């Protein structure tokens, strides 16, 4: 095909990026640990081949994603540090996250401790609040999108399904893609806004504490019925305070779901132990 250059350069910034070790792939893009040959600063180079963006429809979807991500600057969102292209590839320079995502933690750990849940959710909700304040809906929040760095800080990434609302009471109807945890109002095409991110956070909190997704089934058609009917059960083993929060976040009526600001101040975060830091050991074992 076309070998990805060992040195990644752009006509604009004129910086030379040394392509390094493989980090993983996503859909059609391959990710490499890239280093600035001048400053010695380390970044994550996302490489998308132009053969994947032949259609002008596909060129737009990425142009929307890049624009949104560019305007973002937050300690709980993956940092955007420029993008460029040659005649073969489009290179997006992102903030490096060496500890994969919360999904890899979930598969390895299953049900995490409650204090861990608090920590992960707090940092994630803080990132979601900033997005909502800047009128950005993620629409595709999942454990695989909650990246982690050497410090075990949560950083929200992948804005491939993110949309920015323009006016006051705008309720979107077009979602060009298949997100993991989707709100019922999206499945019914009834229209959606900010509160689809809250629904997703409900699923995330459920999955962290229980050890399995709230609507997990081998059949895809069966999963959507469960969501539509609002069919889920939080086991009795879960903290009453936590289960209460999950039920409100996963409410069928979008206007009865808590707002982002309401989440931080909920009993769940203020009642029990909430550590400010986590050791990298939490990737494999519970904290002792």
TrEMBL record:
Residues 17-269 form the Protein kinase domain. ADP binds at residues 23, 27, 46, 95, 97. ATP binds at residue 46. The modification Phosphothreonine is found at residue 174. Transmembrane segments: none annotated. It comes from the Eukaryota. It is found in: Cytoplasm, Cytoskeleton, Microtubule organizing center, Centrosome; Cytoplasm, Cytoskeleton, Spindle; Midbody; Nucleus. Belongs to the protein kinase superfamily. Ser/Thr protein kinase family. CDC5/Polo subfamily. This is Serine/threonine-protein kinase PLK. The chain holds residues 23 to 310 of 595 of the full protein.
């Amino acid at each position: 095909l076309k070998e990805i250059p060992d040195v990644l350069v752009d006509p604009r910034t004129m910086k030379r990026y040394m392509r390094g070790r493989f980090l993983g792939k996503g859909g059609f893009a391959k990710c490499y640990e890239i280093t600035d040959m001048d400053t010695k600063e380390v970044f994550a180079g996302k490489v998308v081949p132009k053969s994947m963006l032949l259609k002008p429809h596909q060129k737009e979807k990425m142009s929307t994603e890049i624009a949104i991500h560019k305007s973002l600057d937050n300690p709980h969102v993956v940092g955007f540090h420029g993008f460029f292209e040659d005649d073969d590839f489009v290179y997006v320079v992102l903030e490096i996250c060496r500890r994969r995502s919360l999904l890899e933690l979930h598969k390895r750990r299953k049900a995490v401790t409650e204090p861990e849940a608090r920590y992960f959710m707090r940092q994630t909700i803080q990132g979601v609040q900033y997005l909502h304040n800047n009128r950005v809906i993620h629409r595709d929040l999942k454990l695989g999108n909650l990246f982690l760095n050497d410090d075990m800080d949560v950083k929200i990434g992948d804005f491939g399904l993110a949309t920015k609302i323009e006016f006051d009471g705008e309720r979107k109807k077009t979602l060009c893609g298949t997100p993991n945890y989707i709100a019922p109002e999206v499945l019914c095409k009834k229209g959606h806004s900010f509160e689809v991110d809250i629904w997703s956070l409900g699923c995330i909190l459920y999955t962290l504490l229980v050890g399995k997704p709230p609507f997990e089934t081998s059949c895809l058609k069966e999963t959507y019925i469960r969501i539509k009917k609002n069919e889920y059960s939080v086991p009795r083993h879960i903290n009453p305070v936590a289960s209460a929060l999950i039920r409100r976040m996963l409410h069928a009526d979008p206007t009865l779901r808590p707002s982002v600001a309401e989440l931080l101040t909920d009993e769940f975060f203020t009642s029990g132990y909430a550590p400010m830091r986590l050791p990298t050991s939490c990737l494999t074992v519970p904290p002792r």
